[PDB]
Amino acid sequence: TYMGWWGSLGSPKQKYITQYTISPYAAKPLKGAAYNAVFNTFRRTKNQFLYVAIPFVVVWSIWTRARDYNEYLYTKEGREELERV
Template structure:
């Protein structure tokens, strides 16, 4: 294998007019293509928020529906645990709760 083939390292791609590799990914340095016509709309003529509110509603509902079973059960559990702890604390710090705790 010649040392120049290692530098080109493109397989069996053609060598360009000036001895440089002109192929591979993106075809860097290749001839420009002809006959391709593209049409674009000016950015100040586009409607950037077309359908945004409609898509936001359905996208939010889809994302909420896919995550609610991961979030809701722990939140419900900890809400009731915290509610029980607050009521238990109020009971133990009340007159009746202190009397009940001192009897034990």
Template sequence: MRPTQALQGGGAPNPKIGQWLGDWGHFGGAKQKGVVTFGLSANRQNPFAGAAHDAIFNTFRRTKSQIFYWLPPMLAGYYLLSWATERNHYLNSKAGRAEFADEEE
């Protein structure tokens, strides 16, 4: 006499009796049939096909969509840096030292 499925199970169902997929990484389903894969030999591929075309047009498209995110901060940073450099040159010049000499104390 065969024991019932409820008596045999303790946790996971028995793969001989019920529908059981299996543990992670070991799914116990039927093997797939009719799946065909094709490959291309490494020496037959052209890895740079269309690279120059994509480099020009893809770069233009991506820059056009992002220019207002990076151009204003870059211009503000450039303006601030040039102002600070000019101000530093002036304060370290003869005229700047003469103008601000009494404020150093």
């Protein structure tokens, strides 16, 4: 398999890396939650916006044209065009 248990997770020989951390009780919880959740969230949204906007814009433009045409067909002035279809 590609993932063992804790003793051997399949990681390559790892060496020269030092990891530091502090106790949760000694660390401030939710330090910059107020500032982070605004500024960093806006940064993430800015980075990922176009990928969700361009597809959304295309699909919603297609949906809007289809919906508007459908609304137009079922009206007194759309009767003839509905009949032709």
